[PDB]
Subunit: 499 residues, 4 copies
């Protein structure tokens, strides 16, 4: 007897023993008479096109694959619910927060960032932690990571950052000179790079890590009053990490470690859960905040902005068909119910467009009619019609133009947005020189102990040693700009690694 994942088929049969097997058909419902031998003219003769049983099956086999996600391609998924435990109705009128005890169906997808579909799970990388809330106001996607910050703060650098984290365009190899040339030319990355080369850069699966919206968002209550917030969801199973040596063994021992962990957990009843907190900032506090409160490379410290609890995320169901329910999951930061809205965070302003854009490419123009993506607890009605692979009644014979004298859907004025005043030149403002070291200094000195600082440097040096010396020299300098002992330790190790 083995773990539950290995016994998948065994249980599919047992859960079925009472029935007779189904009749094996074509895609058109036509029963198949023999599907092990091809129609040929004679035992050693050629194949006929009259063999449409072969063409039907092969034709579909040939179209099985769709594009993998451009980022966060290697993923695990699970489904559960969100349950409200505390009252934050003064801040948000979102129905998903309406009363204590309110449950809402969720779907979660964990991921790495850089590796493709066949890569290993226990590698150094940020982790995705995307959560979709099926509310009565339409879906709410909270596309968060295992970290509160990112490496950049303008969306126009993002394709570049990703390119520098993936394969060299000629050799198709991971290229340290690309990784570090970028990071050293963009020191705003220093904060998240210090998180990444810490211990938490390799979590022991998906259940022992925290999630964060990382972005500043906006909450609007019933009076029309607004505050800015951060979301934190913290692991009730406790932070737990793999060491470098153990992560490396599992990388070839079990490439799908974090997939198998999550599936087995839920199957054995160990339902992982997370505690949803927010931080709140008023509009006033936002004007006096020392840094840019919409700079994704900055946290809101806890002492000044403590955590307010909201509710629990619980995962208690495994997917049944991985493709249908995880590969085809699509999270849009732009899916926001009334009560939740976006900040002016440059990076989040780019994500408002990019996600729906790529989903119409990766999955298709009507990807929101796929079941896991459908807002199935909301009544979807508008003037949008047709498109490839239209799957409902296409809203029937309703008038498809607005306004109209024939009683099709109407706009709901109470769902209008919060009005904010802005003034300034319409212009590309340079955010490369916002504070890039202060919060990092704090992390290095007051969050890490001495042993962790030591490991931080060894993990950095073990990867940076493969870059050229002019890149090393520049990266080390950025590290000295945080703390001279941060830089001179790294440089002591590189001096050895360089023989």
């Amino acid at each position: 007897n083995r773990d539950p994942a290995s016994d998948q088929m065994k249980h599919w049969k047992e859960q079925r023993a009472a029935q007779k097997p189904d009749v094996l058909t074509t895609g058109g419902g036509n029963p198949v008479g023999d599907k092990l031998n091809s129609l040929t003219v004679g035992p050693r003769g050629p194949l006929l096109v009259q063999d449409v049983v072969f063409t039907d099956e092969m034709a579909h086999f040939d179209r099985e694959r769709i594009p993998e996600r451009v980022v966060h391609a290697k993923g695990a998924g699970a489904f559960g619910y969100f349950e409200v435990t505390h009252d934050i109705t003064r801040y948000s009128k979102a129905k998903v927060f309406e009363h204590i005890g309110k449950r809402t169906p969720i779907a979660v997808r964990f991921s790495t960032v850089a590796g493709e579909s066949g890569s290993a799970d226990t590698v150094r990388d940020p982790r995705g932690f995307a959560v979709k809330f099926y509310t009565e106001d339409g879906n709410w996607d909270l596309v968060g990571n295992n970290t509160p910050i990112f490496f950049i703060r303008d969306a126009l650098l993002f394709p570049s950052f990703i390119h520098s984290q993936k394969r060299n365009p000629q050799t198709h190899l991971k290229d340290p000179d690309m990784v570090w040339d970028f990071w050293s030319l963009r020191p705003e990355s220093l904060h998240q790079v210090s998180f990444l080369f810490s211990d938490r850069g390799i979590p022991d699966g998906h259940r022992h890590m925290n999630g964060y919206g990382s972005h500043t968002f906006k909450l609007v209550n019933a009076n029309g009053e607004a505050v800015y917030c951060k979301f934190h969801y913290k692991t009730d199973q406790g932070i737990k990490n793999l060491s470098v040596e153990d992560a490396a063994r599992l990388a070839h021992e079990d490439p799908d470690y974090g997939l198998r962990d999550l599936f087995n957990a839920i199957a054995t009843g160990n339902y992982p859960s997370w505690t949803l907190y927010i931080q709140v900032m008023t509009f006033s506090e936002a004007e006096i905040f020392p840094f840019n409160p919409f700079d994704l490379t900055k946290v809101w410290p806890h002492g000044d902005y403590p955590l307010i609890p909201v509710g629990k995320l619980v995962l208690n169901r495994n997917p049944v068909n991985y493709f249908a329910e995880v590969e085809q999951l699509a999270f849009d930061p732009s899916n926001m119910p009334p009560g939740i809205e976006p900040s002016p965070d440059k990076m989040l302003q780019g994500r408002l467009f990019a996600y729906p854009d790529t989903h119409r490419h990766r999955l298709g123009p009507n990807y929101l009619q796929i079941p896991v993506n459908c807002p199935y607890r909301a009544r979807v009605a508008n003037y949008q019609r047709d498109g490839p692979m239209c799957m409902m009644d296409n809203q029937g014979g309703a008038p498809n133009y607005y306004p109209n004298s024939f009683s099709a859907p109407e706009h709901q004025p109470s769902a209008l947005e919060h009005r904010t005043h802005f003034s300034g030149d319409v212009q590309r403002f340079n955010s490369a020189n916002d504070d890039n070291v202060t919060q990092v200094r704090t992390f290095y000195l007051k969050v890490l102990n001495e042993e962790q600082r030591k490991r931080l440097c060894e993990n950095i040096a073990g990867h940076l040693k493969d870059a050229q010396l002019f890149i090393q020299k520049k990266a080390v300098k950025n590290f000295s700009d945080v703390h001279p002992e941060y830089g001179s330790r790294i440089q002591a190790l590189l001096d050895k690694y360089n023989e």
Copy 2:
């Protein structure tokens, strides 16, 4: 008060008078507060990305269109049922003929051939008359025309023929030189051409024309015995045609004449219905038949192969959304249930590959998961998985391979195909010289009368006159090869049209 088609929105509003209008939402189910005005900075300022209401609506509008059909693009649709009235179980075991009184749902498409989506209905053309039977053993797609025959008899000429009947690739205009250079270089077209330019070239809407499967097909009964057959469905409303004069007036007074006629008939309860017949040829009649009995340019004469009634087709329901239910309809001649099998007709052997093929391009790899296309009266079960726009549970966690020791679906030996014996070289055989005139001579002399022959010639000369002289000279010789006076009449009228 007007015809019922014009009152569609009027009635749509009346059937809703009681309830309230729906909440107008995004495709994500998020209610919109205002959808007549965009999100801008100040009344005369620029448009914001934050306006995800606009993006969501505009983006879908931008994706409304799919590739029209490559032929038969102008279409009208309706729905109904097939009812058995006579017993032909001695020839076929197809569940759709199981017993008298048995109904099966059907869906029909009427079309022209050459015109694109906006072309007129009342033009000289063949008419598609495609019928989809939703049976228990999967779907059965009788994809016929309003002719028993076609212009050619080898599929390799089909892309060519169609190119010649569409727009010149530089000027994008209808070209008579193309049209008649082909027809006169392939005189196998004489038989169908004669049909086209007579009175039935322009039927008075789709309810006053017959439908034929034109190919020879194979029926198989419960003992394993097989016969060949032809399908005829004859209009119970009576053949009725339009004059060249009236067809040309309506071509600009109502380009959608046939579409309108069908909708209004059904809406006022005047339901159209056809009578399905079959002809039956034994295998040993097929060896002694004077022509090639699988020649798609040949009919089976009635005197020797009389019509055997089978039942009624009845259209009694209009589509609710034309796009979802008519435009996305996909018919595959290779959708054949046990009891119905292909002949060796070279032209039908091509259509077994072409239709599924083009449907994966026009509609999508999983187009059979579109409702109106679905085999909703059978159980689809097999080892096909994934593909873009997967719309069911993707078959669940069922074992995806075959054979297996876990009781996934099994093959049904009774559904094997009938086995024929064939012997001969594997090579390309020349069919350009099968009897191209005999059955036409009969049509011209014995079926048509004096006035119809006169009109047949006028209609041909009135379109052949715009081709070059060397092309007219050749066409006329092919016509002369049917009957001297056939050519003589056309050539006398051409001598006049050429001033």
Copy 3:
């Protein structure tokens, strides 16, 4: 002999009389030995899969079609050059205006609006008139119509308007109730509706109509000084229209009238040409302008803003292949070279997204690598990589991220945008009741004469009569609000039409 279009194939053969015909191949370059007869076992036997010549040719015929344009689907194309004849470098620094005498290649596509691929040319509808300039600074797409104004002034209403002008979702029939329910609930349409039912609603081919940029745009000279502008290109062949009586004859006698008139002109050396003008409005004239200067239902009167000439548009070359050079044409308003920039027109702003969006769907992710869409007089170099159907070297092994230390492309600071100050609430501002009648009154009284006013009203009532009475009454009211005699005339004609 016949017109030059009809003789296209004749001339192709003549231009090749001297050579031998090419060898006919598969798409893989494998010569074909027979393509009229299919590979079969015996003369009357089944088709084989081994017949890759059939499948290679049938596979591509099955994928011949692409989605037609969602609007303006029916179009005609030609190519030529733009030439500067006057100096407007004090307003715009764009390299297409640099000096008198400079020539830039162009590509033009004329079109109707609503009719699909097969509809008639000679119908009442606006006419598209899009102009692609191939600049050294990249492409410039002046996507114009044959009117200065449009029916609506907010992009959100654009799907609706179109839906109302196209087919009823259930009957697939042009619906008068949809047309006028919309127009009568949105009286901003009054201006362009009076343009459309006037003599210029049906132009006599594409050479006898003007072209307008319609939108206000922004020009920026070398000093950084900016003005607002309007592009008018006026036919050098003279305004010429068709009467309702003749347009309806041709609509069935020659559906492709405009397409034939443009090819035949060019082929016979009668090259059509236009004269490009601008209006100019300083930022300070924009502030005092009585209406909203960015309202697309409004014109700038000539007395206050006279026409300034710029150059000539000349069309002097037909397409060689219509699909590759016309059907696949893609104009993006957003393609704007330094010195030409958008105004805050709500409609234009919307079009900045729409066109690239739909072109990725209609043509594909890399649609700008199609030769006719290529900026083949600039040097494209950036950090975009891959995609479906990637056709060049994909920019080689160049570093693919930015910034980088390995000398891949750099930004050009002189090509930054003009900076404008905006201030206001971010909200949805209601423009429904900007002045809707003033400039229409002027048109009805001062531009048309007695006869033309008569025909304008007969054309409006000849179409509005089919709508319901409550829709009629409302429209007429909207027409009275322009002038009592406007709506009263229409109402007198409607009274007769309603028997």
Copy 4:
């Protein structure tokens, strides 16, 4: 200084030091003035739509990915030439074998089978060895593996075999039960499984393994005479293998080991090469051969059918952009020049369809117009037109139908296929019980030595122990059917592994 692969960017900058960096443009050729900061309203404001520099680049990033190969996804590419060295023109007329010394440009792709794009290179799996010859008669794709044989012999079992070799449809994990349930239910796989689990299951990269075409193919000479042949291309660098211990270290130390080993070799002039041999079986010897000569699970022994040399394959060029030259590479077995034809092999017959079919999905309808797929040594001319992403003239204004009297391409009769006689019932013949053991027994006893048999069983037991007991027992039985001591040794080690 480092290896060449890591100095890629270093050498790109050096090879450019003379010139100045290009101007960074949009896709449309428009220079950008700042691509590090986004267009906003005030420094902490929201993002505008008229930031088309952002949109244009993100929209393409969002569409960088295409579908991965449905098998053999992980790959490494190189280009070179094929040079004839011996005269086989008595067997084949193919222009690639015309004379000694004749060179042809080639392109080769190496791969594994079951891992996705991200997986490691040093795992136990077959290896792809696909060769594209660009001959004057079009392209010749020889789609070969590093084995003479394969696991199955009917293509209707392919999708299933591949499903079992990949991931569980619910857990997304590698599932030994699926692996061995399939293999133990289809003992035909015994031959190739004993190859897979010997030392050659893991090659030391791609330069130290042989190539084979596995399938019997047909050769046809200038006289029309045919023979059946096998292609073997052996490594001039020598067979060399990784041990299980080192293959696993490298699977985490360098996932891309085989890719780097090829690139560094070519870059340093150590060009790998292969020797091309054929075996030859006359049609007479094919009637008396002891097994089925077209049984993909059978080799032709060397004693009876010796290797006949042909020429060399040499890889002396790396790719410059991996995506454009290696990921978009498409190989079709059906690309076969005159002189080379398929044999009736049931598995090859299915590859004649499957590959073009998946290539139209994976890449697109016109994937043969992608440079590296272009038959650029041959002249493509025919009657195929249009399609998504049509990239050349589209063959201009040339007549698009055949036959025609206007001098478009003609068929070449000498390119016709060899005619073979076939006689037999058209049915599905069982091939499950062709001799499944005999050649395996020879391998085990006569090809392997003592040590190698021991490791063969250890490799097998290490993997089979994770399957259920009932699957183990059945697999061992199939190994006892080869040789009692084969099944014995495996059962003694499974007894230990099961504690």
